[PDB]
Design a protein around this ligand. Structure first.
Ligand code: HEB
Length: 106
């Protein structure tokens, strides 16, 4: 697993989701960013490389992907209900966390 790979992968999928056409395509794209965000959880970013083992940064780090993983769970549900549209609208939330974390964390 590599975080730089995870990051390109989340963006590849986020692009597909915004552009998506079918429920199944949004859904699978969300699954792929879910797998990459999961691997992101145990990758080592250079930006939070050297934080302490017992600190308010290692937990808060993964929370960036954790928000995403939870919103993905809902967005899976929605896409499966045939809400292609609400699954794309949820991409604004994952994307808001992309940038919100990225304003300090990347
Ligand atoms: C939201 C789902 C999200 C997206 C789409 C995203 C995309 C990227 C891209 C394309 C990069 C560039 C790769 C690089 O220059 O290193 C990138 C880098 C990093 N990201 Fe993210 N990111 C998203 C979401 C998050 C969340 C949430 C993060 C915080 C937990 C987060 C962190 C990082 C980090 C640390 C990097 C830099 C990696 C490095 O090796 O320096 N990203 N992201």
């Amino acid at each position: 697993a590599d975080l730089e790979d995870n990051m390109e992968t989340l963006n590849d999928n986020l692009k597909v989701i915004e552009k998506a056409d079918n429920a199944a395509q949004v859904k699978d794209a969300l699954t792929k960013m879910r797998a990459a965000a999961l691997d992101a959880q145990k990758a080592t970013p250079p930006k939070l490389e050297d934080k302490s083992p017992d600190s308010p940064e290692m937990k808060d780090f993964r929370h960036g992907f954790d928000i995403l993983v939870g919103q993905i769970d809902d967005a899976l549900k929605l896409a499966n209900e045939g809400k292609v549209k609400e699954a794309q609208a949820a991409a604004e939330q994952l994307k808001t966390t992309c940038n919100a974390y990225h304003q300090k964390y990347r």
